[PDB]
Every structure is written in structure tokens, then in C-alpha cells.
Amino acid sequence: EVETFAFQAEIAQLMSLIINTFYSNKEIFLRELISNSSDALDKIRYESLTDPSKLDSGKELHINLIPNKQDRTLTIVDTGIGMTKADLINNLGTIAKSGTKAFMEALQAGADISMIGQFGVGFYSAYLVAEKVTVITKHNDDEQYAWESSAGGSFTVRTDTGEPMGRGTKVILHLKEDQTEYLEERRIKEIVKKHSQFIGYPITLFVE
Ligand SMILES: Nc1ncc(/N=N/c2ccccc2)c(-c2ccc(Cl)cc2Cl)n1
């Protein structure tokens, strides 16, 4: 059974700006997601310092990029801290609420969309290239949950029955018909090489 939620007003607005604004430099979506993963892996490593049973759901701290031309998805996978139901629903909404104000104010003063990460809402940039984003996530303190949204101002959350993941976050980007360049190996390593080369964690680009 699937619960449906309404984005906070500001977030909805943020997500139409990103979907509507002519802006050709879409590749920035990937470092925003990868850097989100870097932060979630940081957080579980720190926490496992003072409580090593927290890595009982997986030791390896890594990031995986996975293109699948057949489903037309690019998945970003990490084994960081994962998110609880309340983060998915309420917490991540409550915080990206100021970020979205600042960001929008900046956006006329001639900031542009690629500055979205320095306001803490990098994630929504995934709508530069995805028509639907699905987030499977699993936190030590909660069940594995699937979050999903095609924008339009609503999101669904349901407890996930897929392959169990142990602990971490998968962002599955269901790509727009015209954004399939991001499923290409030489394209992806170009962007990682240019934008994400100093990430403190192994990043693997799976081949198809
Ligand atoms: N890869 C990854 N891992 C954990 C994450 N969320 N972490 C937290 C932690 C505490 C509270 C809320 C989110 C995120 C994330 C961070 C921010 C946003 Cl807007 C969306 C996502 Cl999926 N991404």
C-alpha cells in the first residue's frame, strides 16, 4: 500500500523551475547526486567510529554508477547511511525549504542552476534529465523504503519489497527520451572526471 504526499509549496516551485527553465548544462545533476552520496558515506563512517555494530549491514563504503539502456535508467548507488521514513517524508522537506528560498533569490542576481548544490538542494537537479526519479533507501533504524516522483507536485512512499540492499541509497533516474547520452560510458567518465575526481570513496562505473 502506497501513501501519496504533496511536496511542500517551495519544493514544487523549485521542481518546475528546473523542469521548465531553458538551461543546456544538465550534466551537473550527476555530481550533485554523487556528492550527496559522499555525505551519506561520511556520516556512517563517523557513526561507526563510536559504535562499530553500525557496519553490521555492510562494511564497504562505495559509490556505483549503473546505466541500463534497456530500462533507460541511470542508477546512483551508495552504501552510506540510508534514510528513514521520516527523512524521506518530513525531514528532507523541512530542510530543503530554506535552501530553496535562498537559491531562488540568488537565481535573479544571476546565479544559475549549477549553483544549486551550494544551497543544499542538489538532488532536485536530477529533474534536469529524469522524468521520474525513484529512491530506494535503507537505514539501520528502519525498513527499506521506495520514494518516487514525476514531479507535478506529489510524491509517493511505500515500503520496498525488491532485492534487499543492506544499507544505503539508490537513486534511479528514469531519463527523458532526449537525455540518453548519460547512459554512455565515455559520456559518464567525462563528467565524473571533470566534476567528481576527488571524492573520498571508490566510484565504479558498471559497463552494460
Ligand atoms: N545518496 C544519498 N544518501 C542519503 C541521502 N539523505 N540523507 C539524509 C540524511 C538525514 C536526513 C535527510 C537525508 C541523500 C539525499 C540527500 C538530500 C536529498 Cl534532497 C535527497 C537525497 Cl536522496 N542521498
Side-chain angles (χ1 to χ4, degrees):
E1 89 145 38
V2 191
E3 287 174 299
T4 298
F5 300 86
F7 276 112
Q8 269 142 316
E10 299 65 45
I11 296 299
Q13 234 170 314
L14 185 69
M15 296 171 56
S16 316
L17 193 111
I18 288 158
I19 292 194
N20 303 336
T21 297
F22 180 73
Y23 177 77
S24 303
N25 188 230
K26 303 171 171 318
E27 63 181 35
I28 67 84
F29 82 88
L30 185 66
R31 54 126 206 272
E32 290 310 325
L33 298 181
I34 289 190
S35 138
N36 275 12
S37 283
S38 195
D39 294 7
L41 296 154
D42 280 354
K43 191 174 188 187
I44 189 74
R45 192 179 52 198
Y46 158 78
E47 289 197 9
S48 91
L49 294 171
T50 82
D51 172 355
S53 66
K54 278 185 182 167
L55 295 190
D56 287 346
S57 45
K59 294 199 183 343
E60 295 80 11
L61 301 186
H62 65 230
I63 293 157
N64 286 167
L65 315 163
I66 314 179
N68 180 324
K69 268 160 180 302
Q70 337 164 241
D71 323 355
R72 199 214 276 163
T73 61
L74 169 75
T75 301
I76 300 93
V77 181
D78 69 66
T79 60
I81 189 153
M83 287 168 288
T84 45
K85 220 224 201 163
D87 294 329
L88 284 188
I89 303 177
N90 240 302
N91 299 345
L92 289 202
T94 296
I95 308 305
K97 231 273 289 278
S98 349
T100 303
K101 212 199 171 180
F103 180 54
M104 248 139 171
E105 308 179 306
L107 277 185
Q108 339 98 304
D112 67 303
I113 289 180
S114 80
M115 290 162 83
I116 182 182
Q118 325 164 17
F119 302 81
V121 295
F123 167 85
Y124 298 98
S125 76
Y127 290 97
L128 281 177
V129 303
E131 60 187 5
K132 177 174 62 175
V133 179
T134 304
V135 186
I136 312 297
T137 184
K138 177 79 178 65
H139 191 277
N140 287 332
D141 297 328
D142 214 327
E143 324 271 305
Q144 167 157 326
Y145 288 105
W147 174 96
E148 158 144 313
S149 189
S150 300
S154 84
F155 69 88
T156 66
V157 173
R158 78 194 51 183
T159 71
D160 179 39
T161 50
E163 177 95 41
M165 44 180 312
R167 187 206 61 250
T169 306
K170 275 198 223 322
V171 182
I172 306 188
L173 302 179
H174 311 273
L175 298 184
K176 292 172 170 143
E177 168 156 296
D178 65 319
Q179 297 295 151
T180 79
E181 73 192 86
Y182 301 105
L183 292 177
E184 232 120 62
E185 163 163 19
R186 55 179 214 197
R187 186 62 173 125
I188 292 139
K189 323 200 169 131
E190 176 182 32
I191 307 178
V192 161
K193 195 168 183 182
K194 168 209 283 235
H195 283 294
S196 285
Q197 60 222 84
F198 287 140
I199 287 297
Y201 292 106
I203 295 178
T204 306
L205 167 68
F206 283 37
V207 315
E208 309 213 27

